[PDB]
Design a protein around this ligand. Sequence first.
Ligand SMILES: Nc1ncnc2c1ncn2[C@@H]1O[C@H](CSCC[C@H](N)C(=O)O)[C@@H](O)[C@H]1O
Ligand SMILES: Nc1ncnc2c1ncn2[C@@H]1O[C@H](CSCC[C@H](N)C(=O)O)[C@@H](O)[C@H]1O
Lengths: 361, 378
Amino acid sequence: NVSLVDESLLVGVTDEDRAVRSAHQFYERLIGLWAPAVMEAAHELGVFAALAEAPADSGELARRLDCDARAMRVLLDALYAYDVIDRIHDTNGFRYLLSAEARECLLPGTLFSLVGKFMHDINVAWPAWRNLAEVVRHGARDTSGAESPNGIAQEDYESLVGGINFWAPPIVTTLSRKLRASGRSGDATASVLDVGCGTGLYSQLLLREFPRWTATGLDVERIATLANAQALRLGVEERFATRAGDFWRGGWGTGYDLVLFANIFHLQTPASAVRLMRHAAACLAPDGLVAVVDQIVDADREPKTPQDRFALLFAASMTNTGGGDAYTFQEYEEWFTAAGLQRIETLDTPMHRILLARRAT
Amino acid sequence: NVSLVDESLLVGVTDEDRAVRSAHQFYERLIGLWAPAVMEAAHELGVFAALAEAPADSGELARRLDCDARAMRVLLDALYAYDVIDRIHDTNGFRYLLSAEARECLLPGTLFSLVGKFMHDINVAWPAWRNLAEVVRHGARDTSGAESPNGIAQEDYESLVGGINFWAPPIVTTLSRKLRASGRSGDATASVLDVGCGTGLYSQLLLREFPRWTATGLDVERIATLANAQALRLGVEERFATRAGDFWRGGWGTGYDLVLFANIFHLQTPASAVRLMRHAAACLAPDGLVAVVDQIVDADREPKTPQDRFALLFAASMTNTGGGDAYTFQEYEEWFTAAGLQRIETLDTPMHRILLARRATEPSAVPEGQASENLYFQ
Ligand SMILES: Nc1ncnc2c1ncn2[C@@H]1O[C@H](CSCC[C@H](N)C(=O)O)[C@@H](O)[C@H]1O
Ligand SMILES: Nc1ncnc2c1ncn2[C@@H]1O[C@H](CSCC[C@H](N)C(=O)O)[C@@H](O)[C@H]1O
């Protein structure tokens, strides 16, 4: 399906055979470089927007985009080989197009658009990844020698946050099922705090699921603007508010039934993480919950499941961009304890775990 | 498996379900960026050589390599997540180490070392891949409009040729099995021409398989130097020779029983490809064979098999580096016909296909004469 090596043709177990087999497997990993390069170049050239507007043969698309015809065929067939675009082959030749699901992912301004991820890679991640050895040499450390938090800046998040909206629906449906099995129902009011809310999608999907709930997102000015616009598109604006500014300044509020941290703790240092956890505990209502949605692994750091394997890789993505980590269950439990909280649930999602915690006293 | 997404937790019915599912699959493809970055950084830092010398925990490796302890933990655990390095468990914890098979791939100077591929990526391919958009805009067409061959240069091949040695053994095993099944044997004299031989591994492995054969490798002088050294390493130097120079000149000799083109045609334009095929036919014994080993796909260009999917991607790798293609079976058949050859076999290998061609047996359906000549010139 995805394989680039016909492994059925790598046979034997002599030392030579095993070395050759490993070399092919390592080469296949190395050529994983090619997929973001192809996809991100296609984005830069306007390929996806053009295919959505009108399906096209490769020569026609090259003319429309002022590109070389042969190179465009090569690029389009590579995108088809990655299952990113569709292609019809009949007696008239080839026509390239987007499926509805691909359109949602590849065009700007849709709910699940990956354009912000493409742009994050182009502008931030790809130059950093080429310098990874330097950061490993020197450490993700500040001028005083202390661990630094992750370095992705608010202006970079303006793109990236929309590009990670796709994570939210599986996470929110898993969380919502558990909250309903926890006696939290529709028709009862509750207040949510979404710390570092990004576009606000996690909050906004909760608002759709729980029609009497309200939610408040904390994020920086320009991100809060994005989040309010998205709430309006989703029809939950009357129950979604933002509180713009650096969340380290406080002004979070109190009485929250749910405090959500999605994709926040991996940005922290241990010192900043424990502070955030204590802040969260202080704003909880009686019977409130903290939900951490993150790349979380056991201290053994064994890649036993896809979520564990992704967490170990995500830690490298954090180091690449200046700090943070994929923290361990044991670390979260330490932070919970320090904040007077106790972990009560762990739920798996496609690429994350949800940890739920509540006040012990 | 080695998936990075737990796809059992993604639904796929509604339009929103399916968009979310595709976005996770596309994201998984995008984060393929991270693996070469981690592996190539580890090479630059000396990780693989150090682990081969002495297995160590992250903190010990950080000390030995003058790196930060936490960042080294992050790097090594990522390599472990990619199955590139292993663990050995002690009563007090574990160390990282390389398996025997991984050592052969990750250390410099071994026969199957990927180091030359790491360095090709670092020096050439990484920066090119981020400029891919501008190369698609302009194409490989020269100032006069004609397509250019691939632009990877001799200085680049000094690293890359050793870094692709790993492809050769499965290919040579498959080729040799077909040669023997067809009647060839190693206790009779035969001559092989290896055009653009690189390190010479393909013809050197053939020389080990067929102990009375000889082989001549064609390449530029700095690569021929590598090939002669490797022939000595493999014990076949008495039957392996090189001829340095631009192989597009032709005049390759006479009487060759086998003319091998491994990883050559994808570098070509259609014009240079047909010229090479004609040079091959001109040097072939009456019963000789041409073997093309390349990224080859049907004209339907459908990603049905791994080899098809890799070929379509490899075409992009050629465009990335200035020219060439993953050519189709039908294009090779054009070139065989233009050279008086006929395809007789197609064989699959892990990431390639082998085409075998012999001298044609039947004449063109168009009789000799001016009309045939005019068709030829057009
Ligand atoms: N000190 C700080 N104050 C406010 N927002 C912050 C912050 N540090 C990080 N953030 C915000 O935290 C978010 C991290 S990305 C995650 C966004 C969202 N929770 C999601 O999972 O999709 C960004 O929107 C970023 O601007
Ligand atoms: N015009 C030319 N004349 C001579 N050698 C050339 C050439 N163009 C390319 N080459 C050589 O062709 C090789 C291409 S890489 C393939 C090497 C080998 N056949 C293998 O498959 O491993 C390089 O060694 C390069 O130096």
